[PDB]
């Protein structure tokens, strides 16, 4: 039910499987060979924390009938997170 993700800095981020399936390539991370272990040698801890927060933002606000607030992607963590968003297909 829960999956754990490893940053390039050694940090571990544990999120539910249904939240982590938002990313296109995390589904392939959980597929193939066989709590599941997922490691990124490029992704640091801050951008992966931002992606993990985006998972909870996406699943909670999925098909909502209200005005969905915009995800606060801070200006300093913008391009490193944009690269992560492309790679993760998030």
């Amino acid at each position: 039910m829960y999956v754990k993700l490893i940053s390039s800095d050694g940090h571990e981020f544990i999120v539910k499987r249904e939240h982590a399936l938002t990313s296109g390539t995390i589904k392939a991370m959980l597929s193939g060979p066989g709590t599941n272990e997922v490691n990124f040698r490029e992704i640091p801890s801050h951008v992966l924390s931002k992606v993990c927060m985006y998972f909870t933002y996406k699943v909670r606000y999925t098909n909502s009938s209200t005005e969905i607030p915009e995800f606060p992607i801070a200006p300093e963590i913008a391009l490193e997170l944009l690269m992560a968003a492309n790679f993760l297909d998030c």
């Binding site: 829960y2 940090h11 571990e12 924390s49 909670r60 607030p69 995800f71 606060p72 300093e76």
Partner: protein, 97 residues
């Protein structure tokens, strides 16, 4: 609803505990993935200890404080939480070089 993160010095536990549930439910959630009894380990919001029977709603975990965009952070002790490796700073542009 309340969305918050639970960190033990290298980790981060993303939960969806409602305002009705108290500390005991989050202890069970942590036990479901870290296999640690609530008697062994206790959580630490900032530098303050939460009573088990005390609901998180009056512990400062309001909805407007713990949205899923920026979930609230609580420290887990079995603190010394390692920083998130903050991204490199940007030039201030208007700063005179």
């Amino acid at each position: 609803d309340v969305f918050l993160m639970i960190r033990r010095h290298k980790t981060t536990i993303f939960t969806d505990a409602k305002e009705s549930s108290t500390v005991f439910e989050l202890k069970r959630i942590v036990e479901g993935i870290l296999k640690r009894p609530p008697d062994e380990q206790r959580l630490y919001k900032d530098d303050q200890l939460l009573d088990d029977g005390k609901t998180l709603g009056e512990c400062g975990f309001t909805s407007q404080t713990a949205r899923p965009q920026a979930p609230a952070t609580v420290g887990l002790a079995f603190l010394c939480i390692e920083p998130f490796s903050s991204p490199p700073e940007l030039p201030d542009v208007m700063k005179p070089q």
